[PDB]
Structures are given as structure tokens and as C-alpha cells.
């Protein structure tokens, strides 16, 4: 009936003066836009049908055409920034916002999905959706005693759309919008659906990606523990975003960082630092480096959990990118750690795997490592031990790589290395 229509036909119908003809034609257009086989978004946009659809949104008297056009507009808005721009230019934002209140759950759900695609385009449309005031209508849809009573899919679209209202930066979402949304977001980070949980974490990970004041309004809601918990989840789709949020939170003040330490975070890393998925590792190691860059009592917490051996492990064999984060973790640690602690690090075998990395073709890491070395040597000369440290690095061929680097092209490199040699070698 309404399958495979030509854009030509779809136009004929939408332009006719028969509501039904139009509805039939709109359902037809919807189907075209709902195929994976590269759907005719541009042709439909070219036919000049968006303003027509946008108009059908208001046909309160004919719910089906509202739905059909809503779905059509949704897939067009799911395209390129330009395709999404087309929808916005058509006057759809306020229209879709009106449909949030639609008595037809399936129509408002489409309005939620559409505003989701629009806001997802970026800051500008995100803030435009916000200026038309979509947050209240949205948040209103989740104003129930028990979330479980809502339709599983209906709840996932809302969580996802809110997720995009938090997404992006430069500029970051409006502060009062974040504060308005956070309460509801927290209630979602406690729902049983693994999908709501994942998008919720993405939402929180976004919000925590920025200035410390931002991380604070999130940490201030006491979600950290709930995150550390989700950090132990089985479903990678949840663990990935949860680890990202925790990772961000520790890029803030030592007080905020302490929160995850108290939350129990550190206890989940032996697993995270040996995780089969490299990115979980890459991000877990990065997270570790931001913790080893904090207080000494916080460096102690890392030590007490027996994570130093894990870092040694990552520093030894892992993806290069993971090893670079390890390099930092180790370099940050030796940066603010006590002598006693920098001693432990070497007693764990950090020296050998550290030298071997002085072979990679990445001037920056070669820096970070040498950097860590002088740090270590420094704590050594406080124990006169230096010579042992020398012997040691010489034992595993580190001296060769250093005295070699001494003749590197980067100015800083050959300089730090050259000094190491004279001041501590051969």
C-alpha cells in the first residue's frame, strides 16, 4: 500500500487537499526514510517536504499524521548536521516540544527521539532545544513514583535524549540546565535496565568532563559510590561509560579524587588494569595516573591496594597507548611520592620495564620516563643508594638507551639524558 512510493508520488499526495491522501503519502515517506539502504534524506529534503511535515505535527485532530511526520522528521534529523539543520530551519523544535505532551505515548516518544537527534548535533542546537524549554516537558515525563512502570523503550529514549542535553562542550551545557537535570539523572543511574544505566553514565561522564566546578555539582549529588558500583558491572556498555566518569572526577581537586577512593574505586582496578578490552585498560591506567598525581596519602591508597604491581604489569606488556598512560602514572607517582614509596616502586620491578620503553619512537614518553628516572635517582641520593640504582639500570641495558638518547634530536631529551649520564653514569 505505502511501500516503495517514489518521491514524486509522495509529493503528489502531500500536496493534494485530502487529509487521508496526505497521511497515506506521509506514511509512505516515513517508510522510505526507515530503510538501511542509504535512505533518500536529501531528495526528500530537496522536494521541500520538511515544512509540510513540520505542519502535520500540529494536526492534533489527526494523530496518525502527527506520528508519521514525527517519525519522518526524526530520521531526517538523524542525518548530517546539514540534514538536521533542515529540520530545525523548518520550525520543528517548538513543534516537537509541543508533542511531548501528546496523549499518545507513541507520538511523544517520537518527539523525545527527534529532539534527541537535534540536540545531539551539537552545542548550538542543544542550547536552542533548551531555550525552547524542552527540559521541563521532558523531565515531566519521568515524574512517576516508580520508573519500572514506564515502557522499557520509552524510558530508554528519554534517558538518551537527556544524555545529549548534557553532551558536548565549547560551550558546556547551561549550568541551570545541568542542575535542573541532575536530580532526575541521579534517579536514572539507579534504574535496573542496563541500557538506561549505560546512557546515564554517559550523561554523567559528559557533565564531569570540564572545569572542577562542573565535576563538583555532579560529585555534590553523591553519585560517586553509585558509579564505583556500576564500575564493577559485567556489561561492558555500562563499565565503559562508568570508568570514564570516574576517570574525569579524578582530574579535579584532591578532595573530589578522594571521593572515588572512599567510594571503593581502587578495589576494582586489579581487574580493570588487566581487562581484556584495551580501551578499558587504557582508561583505567589513565585514571591511575591522575590518582598518582595527587596526595601522598592518596598515593599510599594506591600502594595499599597492591596496584603498583599492576602498573608494573601494564608498563611491561600492553597496548602502547596503555603503556604511555602507565608511563605517566609512574612518572606522577615518583613526582609527589615519599622516598619510602618511590623505594617500593623500584622494589616492585619498575626499573626494567621502564627502561625498555626508552626504545619506543615517541619523544614524549621517552621524556616522561627519563623524567621519572631522575625522580627515582633523586630519592636514591637521599639514601646514598644511587650507585645501586645505577648498577640496576645498567643491568637491564637502561644505561645503553640513556647514553644513546644522550644523542637524540629533541633538545630536551638528549639534555635530560646527557645530564643523567654525567651526573649518574658510565
Amino acid at each position: 500500500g505505502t511501500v516503495n512510493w517514489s518521491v514524486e508520488d509522495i509529493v503528489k499526495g502531500i500536496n493534494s487537499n485530502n487529509l487521508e491522501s496526505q497521511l497515506q503519502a506521509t506514511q509512505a515517506a516515513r517508510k522510505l526514510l526507515s530503510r538501511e539502504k542509504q535512505p533518500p534524506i536529501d531528495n526528500i529534503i530537496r522536494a521541500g517536504l520538511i515544512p509540510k511535515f513540520v505542519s502535520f505535527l500540529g494536526k492534533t485532530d489527526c494523530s496518525p499524521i502527527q506520528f508519521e511526520s514525527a517519525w519522518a522528521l526524526t530520521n531526517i534529523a538523524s542525518g548530517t548536521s546539514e540534514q538536521t539543520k533542515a529540520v530545525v530551519d523548518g520550525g520543528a523544535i517548538p513543534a516537537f516540544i509541543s508533542l511531548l505532551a501528546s496523549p499518545h505515548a507513541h507520538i511523544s516518544e517520537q518527539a523525545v527521539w527527534a529532539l534527541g537527534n537535534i540536540a545531539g548535533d551539537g552545542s548550538a542546537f542543544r542550547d536552542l532545544v533548551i531555550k525552547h524549554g524542552a527540559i521541563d516537558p521532558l523531565l515531566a515525563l519521568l515524574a512517576v513514583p516508580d520508573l519500572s512502570t514506564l515502557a522499557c523503550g520509552y524510558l530508554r529514549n528519554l534517558t538518551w535524549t537527556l544524555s545529549n542535553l548534557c553532551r558536548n562542550k565549547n560551550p558546556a551545557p547551561p549550568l541551570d540546565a545541568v542542575e535542573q537535570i541532575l536530580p532526575t539523572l541521579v534517579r536514572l543511574l539507579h534504574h535496573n535496565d542496563p541500557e538506561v544505566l549505560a546512557d546515564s553514565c554517559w550523561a554523567i561522564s559528559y557533565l564531569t568532563d570540564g572545569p572542577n566546578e562542573r565535576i563538583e555539582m555532579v560529585v555534590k549529588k553523591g553519585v560517586v559510590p553509585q558509579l564505583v558500583k556500576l564500575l564493577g558491572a559485567t556489561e561492558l556498555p555500562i563499565v565503559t561509560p562508568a570508568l570514564r566518569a570516574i576517570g574525569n572526577i579524578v582530574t579535579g581537586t584532591d578532595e573530589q579524587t578522594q571521593k572515588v577512593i572512599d567510594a571503593g574505586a581502587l578495589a576494582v582496578f586489579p581487574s580493570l588494569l588487566t581487562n581484556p578490552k584495551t580501551n578499558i585498560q587504557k582508561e583505567a591506567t589513565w585514571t591511575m595516573s591522575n590518582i598518582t598525581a595527587g596526595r601522598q596519602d592518596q598515593i599510599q591508597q594506591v600502594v595499599n591496594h597492591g596496584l603498583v604491581p599492576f602498573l608494573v604489569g601494564v608498563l611491561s606488556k600492553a597496548d602502547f597507548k596503555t603503556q604511555k598512560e602507565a608511563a605517566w602514572a609512574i612518572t606522577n607517582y615518583t613526582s609527589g611520592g615519599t622516598v619510602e614509596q618511590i623505594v617500593y616502586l623500584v622494589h616492585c620491578g619498575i626499573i626494567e620495564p621502564l627502561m625498555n620503553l626508552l626504545s619506543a619512537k615517541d619523544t614524549k614518553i621517552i621524556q616522561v620516563i627519563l623524567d621519572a628516572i631522575s625522580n627515582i635517582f633523586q630519592a636514591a641520593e637521599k639514601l646514598g643508594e644511587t650507585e645501586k640504582l645505577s648498577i640496576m639500570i645498567e643491568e637491564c641495558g637502561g644505561l645503553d638507551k640513556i647514553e644513546a638518547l644522550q644523542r637524540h634530536e629533541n633538545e630536551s631529551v638528549y639534555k635530560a639524558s646527557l645530564n643523567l649520564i654525567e651526573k649518574y653514569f658510565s
Binding site: 530520521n75 527521539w113 545529549n164 582530574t251 582508561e283 595516573s289
Partner: peptide, 16 residues
Amino acid sequence: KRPAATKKAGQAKKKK
């Protein structure tokens, strides 16, 4: 002390 970019996050938009 230092944060970076992403392993693409973002399915910004969803179809049908």
C-alpha cells in the same frame, strides 16, 4: 593532571 580525547563515544543520532 591531564585528560585527553575519546575512543569515539557518541551515537549522537539514532535512525528510525
